[PDB]
Amino acid sequence: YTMSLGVENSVAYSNNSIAIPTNFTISVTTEILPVSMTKTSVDCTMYICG
Amino acid sequence: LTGTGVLTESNKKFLPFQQFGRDIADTTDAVRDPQTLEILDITPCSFGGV
Ligand SMILES: *[C@@H]1O[C@H](CO)[C@@H](O)[C@H](O)[C@H]1NC(C)=O
Ligand SMILES: *[C@@H]1O[C@H](CO)[C@@H](O)[C@H](O)[C@H]1NC(C)=O
Secondary structure, three states: OOOOOOOOOOOOOOOOOOOOOOOOOOOOOOOOOOOOOOOOOOOHHHHHHO | OOOOOEEEEOOOOOOOOOOEEEOOOOOEEEEEOOOOOOEEEEEOOOOOOO
């Protein structure tokens, strides 16, 4: 199928209307980042020639 | 099958026709001794950067 990008939404805009939140939710997002590889060294004479 | 390593005893159970063991990346990890049919583990002789 041809994929949908999301729900289409006419924001209820007019020159004299504002929307204000009457309440909130605390959220705890988890973000995961790589920092370091496994350190390697190769004796290239031992690899090439055994 | 030539090599160089610390031969040891092992608990590996080769099938009666099998002669050599290999690890995941082709490297030999064991051999059956051809006279007394025990399975020797092979581990390389110790090496490292100085
Ligand atoms: C705010 O939202 C929470 C979670 O839905 C609810 O428990 C709480 O009663 C709400 N408070 C108000 C003032 O609406
Ligand atoms: C080789 O000879 C020894 C003599 O003690 C015997 O124990 C062993 O089972 C023999 N192996 C084969 C493969 O015939």
